[PDB]
Amino acid sequence: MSLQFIGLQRRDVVALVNFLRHLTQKPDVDLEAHPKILKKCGEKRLHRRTVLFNELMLWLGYYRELRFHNPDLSSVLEEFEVRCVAVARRGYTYPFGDRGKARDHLAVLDRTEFDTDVRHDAEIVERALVSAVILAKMSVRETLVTAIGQTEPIAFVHLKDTEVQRIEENLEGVRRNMFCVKPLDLNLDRHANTALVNAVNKLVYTGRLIMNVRRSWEELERKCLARIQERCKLLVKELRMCLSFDSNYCRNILKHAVENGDSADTLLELLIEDFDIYVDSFPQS
Amino acid sequence: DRQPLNPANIEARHHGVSDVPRLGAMDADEPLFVDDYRATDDEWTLQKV
Amino acid sequence: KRDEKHRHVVNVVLELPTEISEATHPVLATMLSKYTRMSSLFNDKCAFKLDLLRMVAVSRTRR
Secondary structure (H helix, E strand, C coil): CCCCCCCCCHHHHHHHHHHHHCHHHCCCCCHHHCHHHHHCCCCCCCCHHHHHHHHHHHHHHHHHHHHHHCCCCHHHHHHHHHHHHHHHHHHHHCCCCCHHHHHHHHHHHHHCCCCCCHHHHHHHHHHHHHHHHHHHHHHCCCCCCCCCCCCCCCCCCCCCHHHHHHHHHHHHHHHHCCCCCCCCCCCCCCCCCCHHHHHHHHHHHHHHHHHHHHHHHHHHHHHHHHHHHHHHHHHHHHHCCCCCHHHHHHHHHCCCCCCCHHHHHHHHHHHHHCHHHHHHHCCCC | CCCCCCHHHEEECCCCCCCHHHHHCCCCCCCEEECCCCCCHHHHHHHHC | CCHHHHHHHHHHHCCCCCCCCCCCCHHHHHHHHHHHHCCCCCCCHHHHHHHHHHHHHHHHCCC
């Protein structure tokens, strides 16, 4: 697709095109994480109108690519369900010191189900994980917290500190790049650990992964929409200084407010389609 | 036309730009062309009254 | 030789009098590329006429 700009040498155009082309192959996929690419857009070398237009075009293309590569959630949720059921079974088998609170925590583990919409996953996996951690701590009879209004924090059980920080690094890398999924060479199963503990460790890893992916995508999409809206409003503000046919045409194109991905795609396609009609309104060099 | 509309069949009217396909699409049944503004509840009840 | 199809749209599709032409009407000259790109639906003449009218209107707009 002919994603096109104004006031750029062809080398910068192919640089931007290649940057979008290889977005997922690099760490820290956030746009502000690459000040060189963002600055190549035209800052301080061109008039305000054209640099704003170029930034808006780049943001639209970046948002389109991100929405294109948004990954599949199904297999991870299925794995989480399977592991939750396994933890529940192992907990039902185990001879706890007192069966009372173990009973209701196992009931909570049994109650877990995923909704059709993706916005509710965080809280349900949070409660499932906290109940699983409470069960695991009970199994090795550690003094779980009981302060008023306090709750048990989510943490791995009986793993070495180095391995814990390695897993934290892996999850952080997942947060840096949603699309790449770095596998663990580290093995969470230990001969020195009870099967219940191993199952809880697997479940907590999967829940952390899900929460990280969801939160990262949500905030990235929010940022993209905010940037696009701000650029559109400022560019509309600038175009009102002139009153030619081409400038009025561009303003009417920018009339549509963008707060949804589909509206963003329509705006981008319309802006590309009628490029030759309004191009001369922008000065260059 | 026949079926519930759903958002795939709703199109936004581009005002003040060339829209020849829409002008030809006049008298067509299925695709519904709308402005992107959506009425709020208060003005909905005012229209009703 | 784009001139032949531009003349086609201007004369048979837009049916403009000869006093109006690609040379003397800047917005018409601008819209000619868009109109020539969509070779289909030249049968629906009123659509092209109405689009030209609203293009003139937006050209004159002061808001």
